[PDB]
Every structure is written in structure tokens, then in C-alpha cells.
Amino acid sequence: MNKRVKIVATLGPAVEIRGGKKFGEDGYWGEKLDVEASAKNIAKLIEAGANTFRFNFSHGDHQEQGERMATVKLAEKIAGKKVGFLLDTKGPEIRTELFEGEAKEYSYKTGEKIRVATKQGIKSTREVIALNVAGALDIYDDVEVGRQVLVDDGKLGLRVVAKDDATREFEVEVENDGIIAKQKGVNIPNTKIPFPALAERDNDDIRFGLEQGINFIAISFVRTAKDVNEVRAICEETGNGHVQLFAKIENQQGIDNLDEIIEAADGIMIARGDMGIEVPFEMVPVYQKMIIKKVNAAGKVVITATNMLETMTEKPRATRSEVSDVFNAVIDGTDATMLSGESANGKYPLESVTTMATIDKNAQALLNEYGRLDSDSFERNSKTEVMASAVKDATSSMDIKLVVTLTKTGHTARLISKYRPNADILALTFDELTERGLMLNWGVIPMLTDAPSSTDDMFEIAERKAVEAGLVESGDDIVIVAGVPVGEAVRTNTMRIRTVR
Amino acid sequence: MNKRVKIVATLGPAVEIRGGKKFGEDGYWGEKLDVEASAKNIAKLIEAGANTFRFNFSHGDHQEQGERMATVKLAEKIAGKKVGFLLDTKGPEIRTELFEGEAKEYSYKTGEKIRVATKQGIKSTREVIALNVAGALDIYDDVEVGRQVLVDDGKLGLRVVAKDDATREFEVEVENDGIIAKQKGVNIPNTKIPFPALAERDNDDIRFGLEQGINFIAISFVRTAKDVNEVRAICEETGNGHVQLFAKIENQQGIDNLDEIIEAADGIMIARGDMGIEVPFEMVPVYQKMIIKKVNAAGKVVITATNMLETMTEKPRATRSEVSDVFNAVIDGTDATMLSGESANGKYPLESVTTMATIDKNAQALLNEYGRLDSDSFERNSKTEVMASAVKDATSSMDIKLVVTLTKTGHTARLISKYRPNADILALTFDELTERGLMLNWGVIPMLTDAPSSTDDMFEIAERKAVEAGLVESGDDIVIVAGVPVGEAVRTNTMRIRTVR
Amino acid sequence: MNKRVKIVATLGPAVEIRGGKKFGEDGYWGEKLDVEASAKNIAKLIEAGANTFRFNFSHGDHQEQGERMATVKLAEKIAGKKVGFLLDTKGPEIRTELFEGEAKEYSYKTGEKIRVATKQGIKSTREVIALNVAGALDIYDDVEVGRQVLVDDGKLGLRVVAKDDATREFEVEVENDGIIAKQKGVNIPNTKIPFPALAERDNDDIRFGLEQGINFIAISFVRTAKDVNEVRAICEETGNGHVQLFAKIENQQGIDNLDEIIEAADGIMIARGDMGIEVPFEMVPVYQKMIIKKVNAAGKVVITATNMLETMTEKPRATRSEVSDVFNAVIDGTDATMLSGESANGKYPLESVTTMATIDKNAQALLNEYGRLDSDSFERNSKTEVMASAVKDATSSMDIKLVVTLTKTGHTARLISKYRPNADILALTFDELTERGLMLNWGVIPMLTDAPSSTDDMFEIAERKAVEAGLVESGDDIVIVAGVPVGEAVRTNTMRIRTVR
Amino acid sequence: MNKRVKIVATLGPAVEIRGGKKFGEDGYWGEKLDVEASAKNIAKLIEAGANTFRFNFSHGDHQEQGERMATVKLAEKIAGKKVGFLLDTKGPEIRTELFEGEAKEYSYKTGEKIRVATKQGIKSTREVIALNVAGALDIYDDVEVGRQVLVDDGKLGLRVVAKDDATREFEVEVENDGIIAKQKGVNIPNTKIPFPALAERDNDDIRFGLEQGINFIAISFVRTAKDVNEVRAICEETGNGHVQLFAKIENQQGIDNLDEIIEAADGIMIARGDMGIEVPFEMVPVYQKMIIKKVNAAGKVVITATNMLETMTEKPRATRSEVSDVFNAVIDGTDATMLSGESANGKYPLESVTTMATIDKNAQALLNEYGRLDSDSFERNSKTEVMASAVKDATSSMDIKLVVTLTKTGHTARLISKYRPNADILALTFDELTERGLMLNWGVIPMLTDAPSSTDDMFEIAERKAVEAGLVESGDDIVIVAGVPVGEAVRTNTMRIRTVR
């Protein structure tokens, strides 16, 4: 079993060593980053099956993101395996501020009376939590007495009992025991804060990440196709048209506009953290199944995100509900499953990726029996898609160890992946940007190779690259597709069934 | 809209008021039990959708259990609604003992060296953990070095590093941070402790339970049909033949013998806490889907259990993986979903029941689209089952608000329930024991009524009881089944499609 | 096996004895009809499974039709079984005339030069065949040199080589050996003769048949819904609204207008004789399958007609192609199969009905495996149809010997028949016109009984009538439907599964 | 549009010109055979769609058969198209003998008393019918009084009223009007004549046939696999191992042993004439549908035979039941439809082939909608069959005009044919024997070409041969399969989707 379901792992301090100390150790924050020791930890997550690392720009600053991206470039070399680089934007969001004196968080008890500030550009204290509102908007008049302020995926609730005009502070009662840490997501349900089109901060974050070299952007709180097209414009103007945009669906407007968002984007991230606060929590499983189906029908990538192995933040074993969630995301048809705090923030980042890889690998064996996606229903809209349908058929008719596609742009590999064959897909492509671009497609193992010449045997190349990567051995049956011959073929036009020598 | 998926709520101190104090408040345990304030609390759980309470005999003593059962009996009169009474057995298991000087539990850090004792009838120290082993078995010779000892559904791991012959103690390294409380599960995977057929303790607990008045027994660690038959023999012997037995499947032996266990039992509880430590965690979802399908095909009851809303033990809102888990259990075909520590041991027992109820109600609306069960594949093996298939056909042909069955024993209601009609099922029955015994069947609303005479119009009765229960109004279409006429019919033989006037 | 597929048998001289002589014997035509001896022959066709007799008004005169109808009324009394009375109209057709000197036919050889007259109201001779054109139309100018004149379902072809203006005769070459008999169908393909709306002759024929007492009219060459509504108007004005209209589809205009014709009519007769000459012969099997499907979807009656056992006109055994045709008409979903010359004109009328009954009975056993009709696809458009769906389901779930419906108008019996249950359908109705009206519905055995009173047990009546008709015995399982109670029920609202005592 | 369903046409005097005279013209038999005029006639049958001619060795002598086979060989050069040569064996059967004084046949009326003789090597009189019994068996002791003797596929019945010991004759009553000709079938249902394993006569006929050059043998009255293996042994012994054996199923024993016969044979001829006298006539359609399904699942050829256009023996147009029969045989899944007396013995042999071809072409357009065969259910049991499944998938995904297979032995063409793709199949093969042997496979157009070298581009070759045959034009999409490269490939291993330039 190669793992066909892709893992997005969020990076953060959990994997980072600072002056020989690990996250949680006394004096950790007084040290600087040990890049090699950090890259060694990250190389172990790559080996365990992380296919793409997520850099959440709601956390840290550019320097911290930039160094973390450099640490992954080193980790790839140590692992001898490449991964995707995914930037996750702030979007039209509210975050808790940094605290005075670089305290990182405080703990609160049910019934404490604290304040939430609206004034922009200040720091929090334990008693007066300051907000970073996208567009530096003033939200004091948008939030009435009786509104709930939710901190960190709704873990901690603050009930607005009064408003203090002298300070423009919400007077709040802590509804339940919990923590307020710096740069935490804030939700105020049933309010209609007028966030701008694309915040200056998002424009700067995106341009910085594009300069560092990324493959993917996940756009937070996509409301309409315009939100995706604003980011697309920046990618194309900076010479970064190869970068793929995943719309994060995490509010009613995103659900209402799903069809236009899917057409504009390269994929969807089902951002269930915010989604289950911005829409009825009991509706998230309905939307999850429907989004995965539509995205797969469009030949695009879907990521299922948030709380997948939440307990593994503190404990070496997931709950029964967490394992059920990962398993059922695979059965629903997801291309990729995501870790957030499990990998970024937790005591068991490596064990989290391992555990997720084990569940994903066991669930992929039940797709023939239980799988929700139905490739038989698709219209085959092009001759490459006809070929992808024929490859699925061959992998259904007999035991195929591997499908190999020689793909210039990844088009053939994406269409084979869409049909969910009962085989791994080796995608041989001829440039690194295409190779990294395929790292979140179901079943696709991207591999860089030289562009075939008109004298090359592409079928010999396919078998040799598969053997040299240890994916197949003598006697295995593989399906190879290619455009034959090189420099005459318009598209993938040939399928070969080949016994490996 | 009526909740078709049934809720088993485990009762515990979480819902109990002690001289004005709630569970988790200073000096809670000092106070006498406020029976009436406790019954008012339990009454809210009934109103929120708890269909059966679970009395877990692994905790407390006969006095405590018997008191709790009496308090539920008052809660029913407050709520104006009856519930099922389910006894959950200790079973062939290992618990932690009570601690010296009524200390409730202790906390341990990774690398800590402590001891686990095999001598029976002793109480635990922080530094030496006593075991209450079923059958007071000496297990010291059963447990090799390098074996794993897990406490509290596997939360805390203890590696056996050495064995002390002179005290017959395990010298154990704490693997991970966690808590050792009183009367918690201990799992030693891949050991073969020869636990008795039925332990004296279980025999005593079942007999006390039967004396108090119960509807269900959930038998822990059912290994073979013999485990079910020993308990069935006590039910019959004491005149409690109406008591239904759910086999808890929570190890490989239970899985291997599942078919003969389903045949001996009235139902299966999928006990996923133990199951996911005793077998590979990533297989539990495979077994959950297969058990629900098999139990439904047998016309019996399936309960999905453990960790369903786990985070709500400590937080007012569940994680996205927990909502996914509850939803997917309903889609899989579960008759019932269960709360353990969420209702027994948590800060949010009412909100846990409400949340589960909300998810279960939403999931039931997607069983047409997504439902795994397939009633079309069933053999109809009796004339009542043919009537059940016809009822299901009527609810597929047109919009039926309610199915009404006049059922002496519940057999017709159980068959209609097996077919999962697109409608609520009102089961009009003539005794309280039959009424309570239907409370875990999917979609069944048990209601007590006078046995109709051969003078009575049972179709008028059905409509009148459905209107009086506020399940239907003028213009609603209903399907009524009955054995016509009373004193001649030997079974349900008539189906009526009626418009409520 | 009761035969569920209905047989329409065409009556003619084959069954008629004249002064002790049988059809074909010397001096036969010099005798008058022996009514009792003729009614005895016809009683044997009823016993063999003829459900409806067809009186083809293209043949004979009113007196001959009237006496044949009287002979069947006697045959019913002798057989002790009722049959339907079906009148088949001339329609907008061309027929060969009577011959001079009551010669009935002549024989011709390939290459003979004869004439066809256009002058209306004259008799034929061997050398000059006169036409009876509906509306007494003059067709001399509508038929050019090179047209084909086809006699008798296209058995004999006449090529128009010249036109003689002095006599207004077509000069024809006999294309193949064959016969021209009196009152034979004539087709001239690729001509557009302007037949009127409803010929005076058809108006008189219909009114005569309505006076004699008929159940059905098959309207020849239905072109549009107007053709059906013209006949409907006459039925309603004469107090004969109970008479059912079957549109004969036998030309392109009928195929083009099929949907409006089905909505206007009570059923379709697939008149393949003319159809296979008026449209491409290879298209008739396509249209047959499509018409049966649409008519069944409309809850109406379909008859498959012509050449079904053609060889049995002269021989005691059908060809392999004939048996295949009857079998496949049943598999396609036909309510009824028809005999024409086999019963009207042949040496083996009784053996023809027997042979057809044997094929139909063997094919009805393969409907579950091979049957084309798909009741699962129907929308259930009324509560009686919901009940019909539920009856189908019961007959699919277990072995049901009989479905009994107490039906005032036949509505419940038609809807049960539409769903094609795996059981015979006993339709108990309370007037003879309804009883005869159901004789061509698939599976329906109509039986006359007294209208139940409010003190009657309709379920006891259903079982008693079924037992007394020898359809069921002690131990058989039957499904009874009724509107319960009499004088309150709006519709069939009750289904009972009953073991016969 | 190309005819996918293949036509077997039985040759006979009907197509033979004798010194200027056609069959059925006065003094036909006086004249010498006009070989060249006969070959011109047979050439028209080839052009009209005859794919194989059947030489029925129950008629004539080696001289007659050998001459006819030579005349077909000239017809091929005239038509410019090859056909298959099928020998149909006499088999373990009873024929009528030749009559005294070269009288061709006699006519008999019902109630006529005549005799049937058991003495072998004598010629028939009108009043005493000699039998040519296979093995020259004496059957007098095999045939009881009240047994039925049927002549000419059961047209004429003869009741055995008494047995004459002194002449060993049956005294027989004519049951029905009909004809006793020379060398006609005699069936005595429910007798057990111990016919040899393989008769000397069959051994001689097969050996003569093989010496002339044939592609197929149809073995009459195959009872067991042993009947097939005796003939296979002669084919192998004489170096004729390429000859394909169709078992004729025409009695209950053949039906009972069908599975072992399909396994021994290359195909089944459903010989319905005999079958519908030897088993109940109404079962033939049940057996026809089941045989076609089984033979197709085995990847072998099925021929549906007898009475398909029977009326066209005497009339230029077929009945509606005959067109229904041909159409339904195609829908059932038949590879081939057959003409017997229609082509051999009739007035309209060319028109019979044309008519069958027209119906077969129309029916093939409805196999998507109505087709009984289901290729989705098949096990794909080899890599060539996986390629066949993939080809079928491509023709379902997009509009493919043609499938082209470069096939050494026809194995790839036979598998593609088994899958019934929505396309014609051009089979490019390198020898005439393989070419002719594919002529009865559904959809296969065999074409002879040079064996490609490892220098050649087989995909260019495929396109060029398809264009040269006028099967495709510029812009048409085609699927080509081949073993790439020649001299390395051990099987068809490549599929190409190509647009014709």
C-alpha cells in the first residue's frame, strides 16, 4: 500500500528546535531557530506521508514564515522527497492580537468579566483582548449586547453583556473554561462586518509567499468567485500562473456561491473549523459530502480540514470519532486530509502524520465497496478523459500495480486521478513546477524526468522510472499512457498493458 | 420533526445535585444527594431526546445504582415521558481499584517509574496501582515484559519493563502524560486471560438489576454466543424473559463469532473504546459499517458507542470530527447513538444530549440520498415482514407523515423499523414492558393504550392516538397496520392508507 | 397457470356451421347459419382462453355481423363464461369489392395483366378488380404509373404499368403468385388519398354495433386524436360511454401522433398488418416495444395483432418465428395477443387459440427474468395507485396465488394490472358492463357479484367468490383490496393478506 | 452503415440457373447447370450480406455439394468479397428416401391410410415411405403404436395405428394435409434410437468437405461433448485444425449437456426446426435466449436458425411475426441469423438475404436500448480480454466509427466481438483461413493484409486499410489495438485512439 489520499500537514513550533530545545521546554522562546535540527524533524513528517506543508499566514510574521519555508527546502533534501508548499491567507477574518510583554496566552474560568477592545493596532492584555480585524475595520457598532464572541474554532465563548463607549470595549462574560492565545481566530455569529475585497495585508502576504516559491494558496473565507479571481490576478501578474488556488469554504456565502467558486478555483478546502460556527454545525457533514462530489466531478482537488485527529495534539492515540472522521472523509472521496494543530502545535506531530497515513491507507482499500464517488456517471468530455476512463476500466478488469502517465502539464494525471483507479498513478513530468503541482491529487506520485526525444522509447522510460523508484518489480502488471509519438501526438492517445521485466 | 435515531445516555454524578452543589464544584462530595433536584436534571435529558439511560455497573455499588434507577423513575413522571433502563455489565475485564484515603485519581508524567499489583482485594496507591480483575484472577503469570498496560479507554500507556516475583508487581514506565482514576478500564492487548464464562460479580449485578426493573442488558466483552446464553438463562429463570440482551463487541473474538452472537442476542452495542485498543484502531470503521448492516438484516437493534461527542465532556461545543462521527453513524444505519462520559462525567450532559439529538435529526433527512442500508435486498421471511415491506413501499410511493402499528409484543413495529420507512412509526401497545422494550428501535414511538376489543375500530383508534400525541394534523396521510379482527387475526394482516380529518 | 395475457380471437366462417356443413365443404355457402352448432364451436374457443371476440366490419354486412354477435351471446351461455365484444371499423381504407356472381376470389400468376377499377359502387370480375374506397372517393388521379397496389396485408403486389382514361382503370402486372378475394385490404404506398374525417359507413357500422351491445371499438387507421374523439362523441350521445376505444396504429400519422392518441383512447391495437406496409417493415418491432411501454405507463390496454400464428391458418403447428413472436410480445409487456385469419378463416381455429394460450402461459412465467416493463419507474399519481404498488410489492415478497379487488368501476383492477403483479387478479364488480370492460386488462379475471352492504364482510366475500370460481383452495395466500367501509371509503384504502380457509 | 449481425445462407437449386432456366420453371431439371450464371446469382447474395454459405449434406450427393462449393468460389471472385464455407452434417437422423422413377415428392389428405417402411436401401412409393435411417439402423422394434411420425420440420403428422410384422412396416393415418418429399426430416418424438457415436456417412461427408476446403462444420443433433470431439479428431487428423465446430442443439439431450457442448465446440447453432418438435414448442424461446447468453459469455459464436423468414419461400414479403423473430434474435444477442429453405429452395433467395440484412441492420441500432447481453458482468480472464473491455469502454465514452485489430489468429477480434462494442470491428489478419474463420463473429469485418514487420507503423496501416475499405473518412475517431512491437509483443498490448486525417 502506497497512500493514495494526500496529507496536508500545517507547520508550526511543534517540529521546530530552537537552541537545542523542543517546543514546550523552558527558555524555548529565548532561543533562535536551529534550521538543520528543525529540517531533520520535518524530513521525518515527509517520510511518514506528508505530501504538502501549509504555512498559515494568520500566525507569526513574514520572517517566521520565510525561515519555516527555507527549513522545508532543507527537509526535502534530507528526506530525498519533494513536497508541495501551501500558503493559507488571513482573508476577511478577526484574530486576537499579540499580548503586552510577549506572554503568548492566558487561561480563563466560567463567569470571569473581561473586555474585548475594538481599537486597531494595539496589543492585548489578560483583562482586555484586542482584535486584529481585516481592513483594520472598527466593528464596535456592528456587535450589539447579546452577541457571542467565539475564540479559536469556538472553543471559548464570550457573551457581550455591555458596551463601554469611553474605551469602545465589549464587556464580556467568559461562558466556559478556556484559553485566549495570540493570533487566534475570532467568530461573532449573526453579525455582518463589511470586510473589503482583498485586504492590503493579504496582498502583501500573497506577494511575499509568491517570492519565496509556493505551489498552492488556500484563500480563507472565499465569499464569491471574485475572491478567487483577485488572487489569480496577482499570481498571473508576478509570473506565477502555475500556482493553484484552493478556495476555503467556511461561511454561508461560500456555500451559496459554491458552483462559481469551484469553476474559478483549482480546488476546495473544506475548512470545517470556521464552517461549523458560521453555518449550523449539523450541516457541515452534508456540505462536506456534496463539496467532495462536485469538486471530483470538476476534475479538481478537494482537501478535508480541521479536528481530524484533534486529540493527538495531547495524546498518542486518536478517539474513535477522530478515526471514524478520517476514514469517512476518504470514503466520501477526498483527495487530501489535513492536520492543523496536530502537526503545528502538538506533542505528537510525527505520530499524527503516521496515524493519519495508517487510517487513509486502510480506507483506500474500502473505496470499491463503500466509496461515494461514481466515475460511471461522468460525461467523458475530451479524448484524454476517454483514455482516463479506459485506464480505470483496465484497473477494474485485472490487478494493476501502477498507472504511469508521461504528462507535460499534469492534465492526463489529473484526469486519471479524477476516475479514482484501483492503482497508484506515477506522473512523469519534465519540470519541477508541474511535479509539485500534482502533490495533492488523489493517487498521484509525481516524479521529474527528462522530456522524451523522438528516438526515446516512452514505454521503456515509464517502466525504468517506476522500477528505479521501487514502486514496481519484475512480474508486476502496469498500465502506461503517453502521447505517441513525441512531437506528433496532440494528447495522451496510447494505453499499453506491460509486464515489468 | 421527530428524532428517529435513538439516544442511549449513560447516567452518573454529572446530572446529580448534592445539597445545592453541581458536579465539579468545591465540596460536591461532602453533601447528601438532592434526589428531587437530580430527577429534575434527568427529566431535561429525557425532554432533550434520551430514549434509554445506561447504568454502568463497572462504577459504584448496588446502593448507588439502585438509587440512580429510582431517581430516573421520578424523572419520567416529571418529564411525562418513559425511557428504557439499560444495565451495562462489568464483564470479563480489568479495572483499577479504589485508592487509599478516598483520593479520586492521580496524574503521571512520561518516564515516571511506578508499579502495578496483581494481588486482589487491595486498594491502589499513586505509586502501586491495584487491579480489580474479574474472577479475582491472578494475572501476574499471564503478562510478559514489553507488554502494554492501557488505562481509561487507552488514554494512558504503561510499558512492562520488569516483573517483581517477591511482590508479584509489574514495574512499569509511564509512556505519556495522563490520569489513573478509580474503577477505570485496563487493557493488556495480545494477552489470553482465562476469564470465567460468567463472573459471580456479573451474576450478582444482573440479578440486582433484574430485581430493580430493567428493559435491557448490555453484556461487556461478549466472546461467543455462550456469554449471551448465560445471561438469557438468568433472565428466563427470574421471570424477566422480556429483557433484551445487547452483546457488546469489543475484541477480535467477538468480531470472529459475530454471526452466532447476533443469532443469540437481541442487538449489538458497537463498544468502540475497547474495540479500538483490542483490534487495530483503523479497522473499527470497517467493523462498525459491517455490524450495523448485519444487525439490521437480522431485524435486531444496533447501538454505536463511545467518543461520539467526547470533547463535550469539557467544552460546550463538539469538534468537527465528533459531529462527522455522529452523522456517519446514522448514515451507516445505526438504530441508536450513545453518550458515555459526555452524559455521566462531563460539564455539559444536557447540551451533549441536545447536540447528539440535533445531529441525529439532520442525518435522518439524508438517509434517502446517502443511507447505507438497503431493504430491497432482504428476504421477506414471514407474513408480518411482507406487511413491513408493503408499508415501506407505501412510504416510498407517497408522502406518509406516520406509520401506526397496533402491536401486542412489538414484533410488527420491529419489522417496520427494520425496513427504515420514510416516516415515524407510532407503536400502539398494551403493556409498559413492551412499550419500554421498543425504545431503542429506529423510528419507533412507543405509546401505551388499552387492548382493542372486537367491537373497536382500530383505524379510528390509531388516528385518535396520533392526533392526541400531536404527530399528525388534518390532511396528513398515514399508514395503519393491525391484526383485523381482534380474536380472529393471528398476526398483523391489514394495511390502511388514511387521511387524518 | 391461469393465462394472464388476454386473447382477442377474430370470428368468421371458420367456426360457423351452415346446414350441417363446415367452412370449406362443398355447398357451404348455399346453406344458412346453424346458430346452435356455431355457438357450440365458439364456446370451445372461449374455454380454450379467448377473452374477447373481434367483429371485423370490413367483412360481410350488418346482418352477418349481427347474427355472429347473437351466436357469441349463445356461446357464452354454453361455456358458462362471458367474453368481450370488440367491433373493428373500416376506417379510411381501400377494400376490394364483391365479385360478379358471388365468386369469392380468384388466383393469379406472376406476369398476368389485369385491371383495377376506380369507379365506386360496382362489382369486381377476375380481370377488373373494383375498389371500395372510404368516402366513395375517386383515386384515379392520386395514383401514377409505377405505384404498387398491395392486396391483403401486402401478400399480392400489382405494379401500375399504365392508366386507361376511357375506363378510369389502372393497367397492372401481377408481381407474384397470389389471390384476390372479396373485401380484402388494399395498400398503395407513397400516395396521399384525402380520406374524410369519419366516413358515413363508419358512422352507420359504429351505431349498428352500439345497438347490438359491444364493449370495445378498435378504430382502424387512427391518424390523430380527432379520429378517436369522433367515435367517442357517438358512444356518449347513444348512452354508450362505457364502450372503450382502442386506436389502431397502422400508419406514419398514427405513429407521429401516438402520445395524443394514447391520451384520447382507452388503449392501442398495434395493427402490424397495415403498419408494416405503411411504414418501413423493419421499424414495426421498434414501434411495437415503444407503444407497449407507453400504453402500460398510461394505465391503458395494448393489443399486439396480425400474423402471430399465421401458419396455423393451414397447419396444426406454428413456425419457430411465430412462437418466438407470441412469446416476445408477452415479454415486451402486451396486455393481449390477437388472432385474425387463424381463428376467422383457418382450418384450425380452436388449435390456434390453444397454441396461443400455451405460448402466452409459458411466457408469463419469464416476465420476472426477461420482462421489459418496469413498474419501479412509475410515479404513483393517486392513493389507489399507491395501493396497487403495495400489492405488487406483496406479490414480489411472497407467493400470492390471487389478488382480489372489489371494484365499482374497474379503476383499482386497471391500476393493479398496470403494475403486473406475480398473481392473477380477481376483479369483483357489480354490473355486467364493468365486468366485460375488464376482459382485455392483463391478469384480470372479471366476475359479477352483488354490491356489498355496510353489514357485509368484503374480505369474506372476496375469499368465498375466489373459492367458488375454483381460483384458490384451502391454504392459498391471497391479497384482498377494498374501500373500507362501504359508503364511507372514497377509494380502495385497505389491503389484507389472508390464508384461504 | 455496416451489418454487424452475420448471415448464414443455405445454398440449393433456388439460386442455380440450368440452361437459361430458373428453379420452379417447366423443364428446369432437364438442363445442364449454368455454372457462370449460377455464380453471378450467388455473387448477388454475397453483395446483399450473406457472410457464410451453408452446404446441407442431408441433400444431394458429394458431386452436387462439390460442384456448388466450386460455384461459390467463382461467386467470390465476381463479388470481390470472400465468404465462409459451412458444412452441415446429416447426423444421427431419419430422412425420407428417394422416390421410384425420379418423382420429387407427393401430396396427402387427412385420414389417408399409407405405410412407412423400416427396411433400408429401398426407395419410397407414394403408398410406402422408405426411411434412410442413420447407421442403416432397423428402428421397427424402436417405434410403438400411437407414436407420432413427423415429416419436413414437423409440417406433416402420421399416427402409427398398427405395425406389420411380415413387411416390418408402420400402418399410418395422415393427421393433416401436407407433402412427403425426398431427403426430408422425420422426427419420432419420445423414442430412443441408439444412433452411433459418429455415423460412417458423417465421417465420409466431413472428410469430403475438408478435402474441398471449408471453414465451419455444423454438427446435427449434438447430444454430448463426445459428438463434438469425434469431429474435432477428424479435423486435427487431416490437418484442418483451423475448422470451427458449431454444435447444433436440437433435442433435450443437447439442452441437458449444453455447458459441456459449449466447452467442446467453437459455437452453437440453435437448430429450432428440430428443437421445437423434440421439446415443447413454447420452450424454444426460453432456450434460445439462454443459449445466446451462455455462448456469448464463453466468447464463442451463436447462430439462430430456421423459419426466420419462412413465408419468403413462396412470397416476396415476410410476415410481421417473421420480421419480429429476426429482430428479437438480434436483440437477444445472436452473432448470426440463418436462412434455410428461403435461400436454398424458395422463389426469393436474393430478396430473403436483402430482407434479413435490412432487419439485422435496424435491430443493431437498438442494442444500446434493448440489448439482452451484459458485458459488465464478465470476468476479464486474460490481458487480451482486459484490452477488449477497455476498447468497449472507449466506444461507450465517445463516438467511435471503427475498432481496428491487427490479429494473427483472430483471438483479439473474437474478444472485442464478445464485448459487443458500439462500433464495427475491422480485423486485419495475415492469412485467408483466419480471415474466413472470423466471418460469423458479430461486428467483425475480416480483411487480409501483409504481416507487419518491426519497421512498420501498425497504426498508420490500420488507418490506411480502414480508408481504403471506405469504412471511415477524415475526422472520424477510431480505436486501434495491436501487439507492439512485432517480434517482442506476446499479445495485443496497445490501444490507440486516432482521428482519421
Ligand SMILES: O=P(O)(O)OC[C@H]1O[C@](O)(COP(=O)(O)O)[C@@H](O)[C@@H]1O
Ligand atoms: O484531450 P484534451 O482534454 O483535449 O487535452 C488535450 C491537451 O492535453 C495535453 O495533451 C496536455 O496533456 P499532458 O499535460 O497530460 O501531456 C495538451 O497537449 C493537449 O492540448
Ligand SMILES: O=P(O)(O)OC[C@H]1O[C@](O)(COP(=O)(O)O)[C@@H](O)[C@@H]1O
Ligand atoms: O385513488 P384515485 O386514483 O383518486 O381514484 C379514486 C376513485 O376511484 C374510485 O374508488 C373507483 O375505484 P373502483 O372502481 O376500483 O372502486 C372512485 O370512487 C374514486 O373517486
Ligand SMILES: [Mg+2]
Ligand atoms: Mg478558517
Ligand SMILES: [Mg+2]
Ligand atoms: Mg468496553
Ligand SMILES: [Mg+2]
Ligand atoms: Mg389494418
Ligand SMILES: [Mg+2]
Ligand atoms: Mg435439424
